[PDB]
Amino acid sequence: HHHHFNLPPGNYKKPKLLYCSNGGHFLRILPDGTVDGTRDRSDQHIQLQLSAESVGEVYIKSTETGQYLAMDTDGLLYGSQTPNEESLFLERLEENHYNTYISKKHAEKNWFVGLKKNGSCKRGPRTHYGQKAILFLPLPV
Template identity: 40%
Template sequence: MCKWTPPAIGLHPNPAAAGTSAAVPPVLPRAASFRLACIALLLAAVSALGGCPQGDPGDAGHKQLQGLVEAANCSWTLERHARSYNHLEGDVRLRHLYSANKFFLCIDKSGKVDGTRRKNYADSLMEIRSVSVGVVAIKSVSTGLYLAMSKKGTLFGSVKYSPSCKFKERIEENGYNTYASLRWKYGGRQMFVSLNGRGKPRRGHKARRRHPSTHFLPMLPS
């Protein structure tokens, strides 16, 4: 914080000129100039950072900063709160998960996870529900079974919803989504939902984020 001390000298640069009748323009004391420079830098920093200074509202320095910010038409609040993403929880989408290998993910009534090339196949229509930020549960609409992954990375249809049914949904750079198990990892690496070139599910630990087999495009039912 820049602190200004009252100048000990007069406004005249030459003491001898103080007693003359000629008008001499006042010179701004060095301390005052330094203070104005500090204020200008402060306002520029506030504008560039896109936020207001934080601190104890009862602190004198905080009140001084607040006054400077308000003078600069600052519209932000001094007390910033974390954003709430609760509106995303419970969001439900009906989609066909179409893989980059050109298969639709499906779960049959026996709990077998497979891929099919049949468009609008009943077992491939999925209910994708957001259970938390970036985490979804995937359920077959026709069979009512949840997509789940075992500790070994095997995909299966589960009758009951459990932590094994939670997947981290991420939109990749190519526009496709990847789904990684939230619960299980293999050697510290994420395990992904994946369909190979024959439409068969791959073990989660054999799939990688950049593999086309792990990329799915959520398609609206027609």
């Protein structure tokens, strides 16, 4: 482990909306495998179903397309057809309140899932502890 084990409360029974406090965008996985954020709560690609692999590890999948969130070798996020090693994220509590997601495969480099105020996703290496971009609040759908 290169990371703490403070886990957020909550379960994966129902799908969720990953709201990012940085710009107020919901994490979105488009059909063409593109990943970004939108403030449109009616968007049909922001409904995400989380599932646990091992305690504290999750998959984040679009309930609309079935694509799995994943982060590539350059730290770029994209939607995957099937759940691979790049699709696993460490879901942790942050600042005693928010949820953060670290790429399991790139955990040693502290690459996080994150959204900029303009709604575009952050690239792995550009993320780090302390940023508001990495802070998420799961909301019911």
